[PDB]
C-alpha cells in the first residue's frame, strides 16, 4: 500500500485510531499535559484523513515510524523537558527510531492516581465522557509506557461499560466499585505478566521459552500435529522477541501476521477459533490468546510405546534430542490440559535426565524401563496441595483462609516486613478464592497463571530489599523449582521472638468506623505482629487470643462508652493474652 497511515485508519477506524495515537504519544511524552496530547492526536488524525482522500497527497507515502519521529521532534520543549531524547532528532532513520526506543522512561516520577468519589466520577462521565475516558487513558499510559497499546484500549472499553451501567443504578457504588477493583487487579496482573515474559526470554533463554510454548499450545490445540505446533512455536518466539524489543508497530504487525496464518489454517489447528477469526484485525490476536482449549482426539494411545518400549528410543533421541523431547512434551500436554506447564516441564526434564543417563549405559532399555514411575510423585505433590488448600478455604472463607496463610508464612519467614506479609497473604487467599471455584481440571492451570505473577513480584521486591537467603535461593532457582522451593520452606528455628510493644497491640474505637478492608488489614497486621512476638504459639493458643480479641471489638464497638472500653478492656485482653502465651 502507498500510504501506511491511510491503511491503518481504514483498518482500525477513526475512533480506535485516535485512542491508539493518544496512547502511543502518552507513553513517550509522559510529562506533557493532556491538552497538548489532544492537539497532537487531532493533527495526526486530520493528516490521516488527507491521505485517506488522496494516498498520493504530500507526506502520505512516509513511514508511520518516520511520521511519529517527526512529530516528537516538533515538540518545542523536548530538550528542556526530556534532555537526551531530543538528541535522537539529530540522527537519521532507522537510527532515530532505535534512539527513541532506548530513551523511554520506565519510572515516570508521577503522583499515584487517586480514585475519586463515585458521584464525582459519574458526574464527570455524564457531562464529558470522551474527555473523562481519554484523560484516564492518558494518565494510565504515561504511568505504564510498555503496556501493549491495543490491550490498554480494550481495558478502556471495559471501564466505559462499567460507568455506563453503574452510574444509572440505584446503589451506584455497590455496582461500580467492585468492577473498578476487578479491572485494576486484572490490569496490574497483565502489566506484570508482560514484563515477566520479556525478562524470562533474556534470563532463561529461547530454548526455555519454546518448551513452555510447545506445552501450552499442545494443551490448547491438541488435535494439531507436532509439526504445526512446532511451526506456531517458532513464529510465536519471533513475535515475543520483536515485541520485547519495544517497537509497537513491529510487534502489532508480527502478531497480526500470526493471527492471519492461524485463522487461514483452523482445520489444521483448532475448532474453537471461528469467532476470534471473524473479529476485526485489532482484536483477533487477543481473542486467539484467550481461546478455550479444543477437545483432544477421543482415543489416544499410551506414551510408553514410543517413549519407553520402542528399541529405537536412544536412536531417535540422538538424531535430534530437542525434537524428541518436544514430541514427548507435545504428547504429554495434549493429554493433560489439567496440568500446569511447569509440571509438564518437570516431567520432560526427568525423561531427558533419564535418557542422558541410560542411553550411554551398559543396558539402556532396562535402565529407563520404569521412567513413568518417576513422574507420579511429581504429579501428586501439586495435586494434593490444591485439594488440601481448596478444602481448608471452603471451611474458612477468604479472610480466615488469608489469616491461616498469614500464620503459616510469618512462621516460615518472620524477617519479612509486616506490610509485605499482609499483602502477599491476602493476594494468595484471592488466588485460592478464584481458582478453587474452577473445577479440579482447571485449578492447577488457574493457580499457575496467578502464582507466576504473585511470586515474581515477591522475588522482585526481595532483590531490592533482601531479608532471607532462603527466599533468595527459591527466587534464584530454576523457574520449574520456584514454587516447590517456597512450599518446602519450614518454620524458622533460628528467629528470635520480636520484643513486645504495647502500641502494636493498642486499639481505638476508630476501628469501628473503618471500612471492612481497612479493618481487616489492621487486624491482620496485628496477627502478623502477634506471631512475630510469640512464634512458638500453638494454633489452639492463637485461636484463643483471636477469639478473645474478636469478642473485645464487637463489645467495645457496641458500648455506650467506647473510647474507654477499648482502653480499659484492652489493657486486660493484652495482659491475659501475654500470659496464655
Ligand atoms: O505446578 C506448580 O508448581 C504450580 F506453580 O503451583 C501449584 F501446583 F498450583 C501449587 F502447587 F502452588 C498449588 F498449591 F497451587 F497446587 C502451578 F501453579 F504451576 F501448578
Ligand atoms: O504453594 C504454596 O505453599 C504457596 F503457599 O501457595 C499455595 F499454598 F499454593 C497457596 F496457598 F497460595 C494456594 F492458594 F495457591 F494454594 C506458595 F506461597 F508457596 F506459593
Ligand atoms: C485503562 C483505561 C482507563 C480509562 C478509564 C478509567 C476510568 C476509571 C478511573 C478511576 C480508576 C482509578 C484507578 C483505580 O481503580 O484505582
Ligand atoms: C520447538 C520444538 C523443540 C524446541 C523446544 C524443546 C526443548 C525440550 C525442553 C527440555 C528441557 C526442559 C527444561 C527447560 O528448558 O526449562
Ligand atoms: C503514529 C501513531 C501510530 C499508532 C498506531 C498504532 C497501531 C497499533 C494497532 C495494531 C493492531 C493490533 C494487531 C494485533 O495486536 O493483533
Ligand atoms: C501480646 C499481646 C497480643 C494482644 C492480643 C491481640 C492480638 C489479636 C490480633 C489478631 C486478631 C485476629 C483478627 C480476627 O480473628 O478476626
Ligand atoms: Br520486605
Amino acid at each position: 500500500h502507498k500510504s501506511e497511515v491511510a491503511h491503518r485508519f481504514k483498518d482500525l477506524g477513526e475512533e480506535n485510531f485516535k485512542a491508539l495515537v493518544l496512547i502511543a504519544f502518552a507513553q513517550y511524552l509522559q510529562q506533557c499535559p493532556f491538552e497538548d496530547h489532544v492537539k497532537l492526536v487531532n493533527e495526526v488524525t486530520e493528516f490521516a484523513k488527507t491521505c485517506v482522500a488522496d494516498e498520493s497527497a504530500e507526506n502520505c507515502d512516509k513511514s508511520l515510524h518516520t511520521l511519529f519521529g517527526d512529530k516528537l521532534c516538533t515538540v518545542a520543549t523536548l530538550r528542556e523537558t526530556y534532555g537526551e531524547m531530543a538528541d535522537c532528532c539529530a540522527k537519521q532513520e532507522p537510527e532515530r527510531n532505535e534512539c527513541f526506543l532506548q530513551h523511554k522512561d520506565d519510572n515516570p516520577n508521577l503522583p499515584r492516581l487517586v480514585r475519586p468519589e463515585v458521584d464525582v466520577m459519574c458526574t464527570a462521565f455524564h457531562d464529558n465522557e470522551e474527555t473523562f475516558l481519554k484523560k484516564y487513558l492518558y494518565e494510565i499510559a504515561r504511568r505504564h509506557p510498555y503496556f501493549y497499546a491495543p490491550e490498554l484500549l480494550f481495558f478502556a472499553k471495559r471501564y466505559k461499560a462499567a460507568f455506563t451501567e453503574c452510574c444509572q443504578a440505584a446503589d451506584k457504588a455497590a455496582c461500580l466499585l467492585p468492577k473498578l477493583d476487578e479491572l485494576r487487579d486484572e490490569g496490574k496482573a497483565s502489566s506484570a505478566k508482560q514484563r515477566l515474559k520479556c525478562a524470562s526470554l533474556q534470563k532463561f533463554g529461547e530454548r526455555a521459552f519454546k518448551a513452555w510454548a510447545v506445552a501450552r499450545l499442545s494443551q490448547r490445540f491438541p488435535k494439531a500435529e507436532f509439526a504445526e505446533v512446532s511451526k506456531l512455536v517458532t513464529d510465536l518466539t519471533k513475535v515475543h522477541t520483536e515485541c520485547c524489543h519495544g517497537d509497537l508497530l513491529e510487534c502489532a504487525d508480527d502478531r497480526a501476521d500470526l493471527a492471519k496464518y492461524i485463522c487461514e489454517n483452523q482445520d489444521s489447528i483448532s475448532s474453537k477459533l471461528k469467532e476470534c477469526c471473524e473479529k476485526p484485525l485489532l482484536e483477533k490476536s487477543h481473542c486467539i490468546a484467550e481461546v478455550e482449549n479444543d477437545e483432544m482426539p477421543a482415543d489416544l494411545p499410551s506414551l510408553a510405546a514410543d517413549f519407553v518400549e520402542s528399541k529405537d528410543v536412544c536412536k531417535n533421541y540422538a538424531e535430534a534430542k530437542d525434537v524428541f523431547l518436544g514430541m514427548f512434551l507435545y504428547e504429554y500436554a495434549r493429554r493433560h490440559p489439567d496440568y500446569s506447564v511447569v509440571l509438564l516441564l518437570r516431567l520432560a526434564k526427568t525423561y531427558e535426565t533419564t535418557l542422558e543417563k541410560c542411553c550411554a549405559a551398559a543396558d539402556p532399555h532396562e535402565c529407563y524401563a520404569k521412567v513413568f514411575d518417576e513422574f507420579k510423585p511429581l504429579v501428586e505433590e501439586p495435586q494434593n496441595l490444591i485439594k488440601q488448600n481448596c478444602e481448608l478455604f471452603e471451611q474458612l472463607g477468604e479472610y480466615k483462609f488469608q489469616n491461616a496463610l498469614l500464620v503459616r508464612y510469618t512462621k516460615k519467614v518472620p524477617q519479612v516486613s509486616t506490610p509485605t506479609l499482609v499483602e502477599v497473604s491476602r493476594n494468595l487467599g484471592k488466588v485460592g478464592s478464584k481458582c478453587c471455584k474452577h473445577p479440579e481440571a482447571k485449578r492447577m492451570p488457574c493457580a499457575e497463571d496467578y502464582l507466576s505473577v504473585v511470586l515474581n513480584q515477591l522475588c522482585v521486591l526481595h532483590e531490592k530489599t533482601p531479608v532471607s537467603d532462603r527466599v533468595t535461593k527459591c527466587c534464584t532457582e530454576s523457574l520449574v523449582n520456584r514454587r516447590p522451593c517456597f512450599s518446602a520452606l519450614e518454620v524458622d528455628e533460628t528467629y528470635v521472638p520480636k520484643e513486645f510493644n504495647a502500641e502494636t497491640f493498642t486499639f481505638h474505637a476508630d476501628i469501628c468506623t473503618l471500612s471492612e478492608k481497612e479493618r481487616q488489614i489492621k487486624k491482620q497486621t496485628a496477627l502478623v505482629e502477634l506471631v512475630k512476638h510469640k512464634p512458638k504459639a500453638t494454633k489452639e493458643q492463637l485461636k484463643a487470643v483471636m477469639d478473645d480479641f474478636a469478642a473485645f471489638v464487637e463489645k467495645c464497638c457496641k458500648a455506650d462508652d467506647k473510647e474507654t472500653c477499648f482502653a480499659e478492656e484492652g489493657k486486660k485482653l493484652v495482659a491475659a493474652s501475654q500470659a496464655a502465651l
Side-chain angles (χ1 to χ4, degrees), residues 1-463 465-581:
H1 44 63
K2 158 163 245 181
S3 177
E4 186 183 348
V5 75
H7 189 264
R8 306 249 172 204
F9 193 91
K10 276 137 99 192
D11 198 359
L12 291 171
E14 171 163 355
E15 288 312 317
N16 296 316
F17 174 96
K18 298 177 57 220
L20 289 162
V21 174
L22 173 60
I23 300 159
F25 281 114
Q27 297 185 308
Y28 278 101
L29 302 174
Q30 316 164 236
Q31 292 293 150
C32 280
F34 176 66
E35 290 87 23
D36 288 8
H37 287 275
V38 165
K39 166 258 220 221
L40 271 186
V41 164
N42 293 324
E43 287 175 355
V44 171
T45 302
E46 285 313 301
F47 167 70
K49 289 186 181 166
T50 80
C51 301
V52 169
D54 184 5
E55 249 200 338
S56 73
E58 190 103 337
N59 309 308
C60 287
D61 58 345
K62 297 174 143 158
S63 91
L64 267 182
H65 286 93
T66 301
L67 295 156
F68 191 81
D70 292 347
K71 206 89 197 158
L72 282 193
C73 289
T74 70
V75 169
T77 62
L78 194 66
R79 174 169 309 273
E80 73 171 292
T81 305
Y82 305 99
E84 266 192 277
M85 187 188 199
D87 295 323
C88 300
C89 297
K91 317 174 123 64
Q92 320 301 129
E93 293 286 9
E95 297 73 33
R96 182 179 70 168
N97 184 76
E98 187 81 359
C99 185
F100 278 137
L101 288 172
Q102 301 279 340
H103 290 116
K104 176 194 278 178
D105 189 0
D106 173 44
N107 189 7
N109 276 280
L110 287 171
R112 78 166 192 90
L113 282 175
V114 291
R115 182 178 302 186
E117 293 287 290
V118 170
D119 53 346
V120 167
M121 293 198 274
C122 281
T123 291
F125 183 78
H126 171 282
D127 298 329
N128 21 51
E129 177 182 305
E130 183 162 342
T131 302
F132 170 92
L133 293 175
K134 305 290 183 77
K135 200 115 191 20
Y136 277 110
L137 196 45
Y138 154 87
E139 293 293 354
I140 305 302
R142 64 196 300 227
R143 278 171 186 69
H144 309 257
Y146 295 105
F147 195 130
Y148 191 53
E151 190 176 331
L152 194 58
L153 175 56
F154 300 153
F155 273 97
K157 290 165 170 180
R158 285 175 76 193
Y159 276 99
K160 179 171 154 144
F163 282 107
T164 286
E165 157 168 38
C166 291
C167 288
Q168 68 177 300
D171 189 354
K172 304 148 108 184
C175 177
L176 188 72
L177 296 179
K179 293 172 181 246
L180 301 173
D181 284 355
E182 186 181 68
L183 281 177
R184 162 203 72 213
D185 293 353
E186 293 192 21
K188 283 158 65 198
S190 176
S191 203
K193 203 172 303 269
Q194 290 172 57
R195 281 94 163 136
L196 161 58
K197 301 168 157 164
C198 289
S200 290
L201 184 57
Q202 269 87 285
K203 149 141 279 208
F204 298 107
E206 239 183 32
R207 181 191 188 251
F209 172 94
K210 292 192 189 153
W212 201 92
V214 168
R216 189 52 191 99
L217 293 197
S218 297
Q219 284 180 312
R220 184 172 288 146
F221 309 135
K223 300 181 176 143
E225 312 212 313
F226 175 70
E228 188 76 21
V229 169
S230 179
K231 146 132 196 95
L232 302 165
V233 162
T234 299
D235 291 359
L236 187 56
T237 308
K238 319 307 171 251
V239 170
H240 273 78
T241 289
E242 184 69 42
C243 290
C244 290
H245 183 252
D247 192 313
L248 170 69
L249 291 206
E250 300 287 348
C251 177
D253 297 354
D254 286 1
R255 289 177 43 104
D257 288 342
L258 185 53
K260 288 176 214 234
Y261 173 76
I262 281 150
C263 288
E264 280 169 352
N265 293 272
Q266 309 179 49
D267 287 343
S268 310
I269 298 166
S270 177
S271 66
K272 317 283 202 144
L273 293 162
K274 203 246 331 158
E275 281 127 34
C276 287
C277 287
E278 281 168 332
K279 281 178 188 287
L281 170 131
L282 178 60
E283 321 170 357
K284 204 179 286 185
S285 67
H286 189 79
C287 192
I288 297 160
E290 255 103 343
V291 77
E292 109 176 295
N293 293 337
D294 197 12
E295 287 81 31
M296 74 189 57
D299 263 301
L300 283 163
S302 157
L303 264 107
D306 306 339
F307 295 102
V308 186
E309 288 140 12
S310 177
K311 49 180 184 51
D312 292 346
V313 159
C314 290
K315 162 175 164 316
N316 292 355
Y317 174 60
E319 207 173 296
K321 291 185 180 181
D322 284 11
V323 176
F324 196 73
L325 296 168
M327 290 187 278
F328 176 89
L329 194 50
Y330 156 84
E331 297 285 7
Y332 215 144
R334 59 196 305 213
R335 297 165 161 81
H336 289 279
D338 59 327
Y339 287 5
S340 58
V341 174
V342 283
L343 174 52
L344 287 155
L345 296 170
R346 289 177 200 130
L347 302 183
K349 180 65 224 95
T350 298
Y351 184 56
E352 168 184 56
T353 292
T354 285
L355 281 198
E356 281 292 315
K357 169 217 185 130
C358 298
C359 282
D363 196 350
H365 180 277
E366 173 97 343
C367 179
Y368 58 51
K370 51 214 201 169
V371 66
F372 280 10
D373 304 331
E374 316 188 358
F375 298 160
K376 163 99 130 30
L378 293 178
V379 163
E380 295 188 334
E381 184 265 335
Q383 278 177 337
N384 299 338
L385 212 47
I386 288 150
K387 168 246 239 336
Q388 162 253 322
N389 284 283
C390 280
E391 281 173 342
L392 173 67
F393 167 81
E394 261 210 300
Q395 322 172 0
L396 263 57
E398 213 189 72
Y399 170 77
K400 299 186 61 143
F401 179 66
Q402 289 168 337
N403 292 8
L405 289 176
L406 212 32
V407 182
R408 163 191 311 184
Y409 305 144
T410 303
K411 284 178 179 236
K412 279 176 171 236
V413 188
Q415 299 78 32
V416 165
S417 68
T418 299
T420 296
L421 273 170
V422 170
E423 185 81 343
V424 175
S425 303
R426 281 167 62 71
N427 283 337
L428 292 168
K430 290 144 90 63
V431 175
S433 205
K434 147 75 120 58
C435 293
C436 290
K437 290 329 164 116
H438 290 245
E440 125 105 359
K442 303 211 313 244
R443 287 176 163 191
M444 202 179 324
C446 182
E448 177 175 43
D449 204 270
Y450 292 111
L451 280 180
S452 56
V453 278
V454 170
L455 291 186
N456 186 266
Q457 294 287 299
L458 217 169
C459 283
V460 156
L461 288 178
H462 198 258
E463 187 281 304
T465 322
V467 304
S468 155
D469 53 279
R470 313 154 63 204
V471 172
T472 301
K473 164 62 143 347
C474 290
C475 286
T476 57
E477 278 280 283
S478 56
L479 223 57
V480 303
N481 285 345
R482 184 166 274 190
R483 196 273 316 155
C485 184
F486 275 111
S487 305
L489 293 170
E490 296 196 276
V491 176
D492 198 339
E493 302 274 351
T494 78
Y495 172 82
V496 173
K498 201 157 149 175
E499 185 100 353
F500 181 75
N501 182 340
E503 169 74 306
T504 298
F505 304 107
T506 297
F507 309 89
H508 315 83
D510 66 313
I511 65 106
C512 317
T513 81
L514 276 184
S515 73
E516 181 65 11
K517 180 126 169 193
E518 313 164 282
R519 190 170 33 251
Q520 288 181 348
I521 282 133
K522 258 193 138 127
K523 286 138 79 192
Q524 290 169 330
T525 296
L527 180 47
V528 163
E529 286 286 350
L530 177 51
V531 182
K532 273 170 166 180
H533 173 53
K534 294 294 182 205
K536 297 275 190 301
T538 84
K539 222 9 235 253
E540 294 94 13
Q541 299 183 296
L542 284 164
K543 158 145 198 200
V545 173
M546 289 164 81
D547 273 345
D548 275 358
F549 173 90
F552 161 68
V553 170
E554 155 261 1
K555 150 186 272 264
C556 293
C557 282
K558 180 228 45 253
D560 297 287
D561 191 356
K562 314 228 194 277
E563 40 262 62
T564 319
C565 196
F566 275 96
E568 308 296 329
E569 288 265 27
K571 288 173 224 335
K572 352 183 20 192
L573 168 76
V574 167
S577 298
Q578 295 174 265
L581 319 166

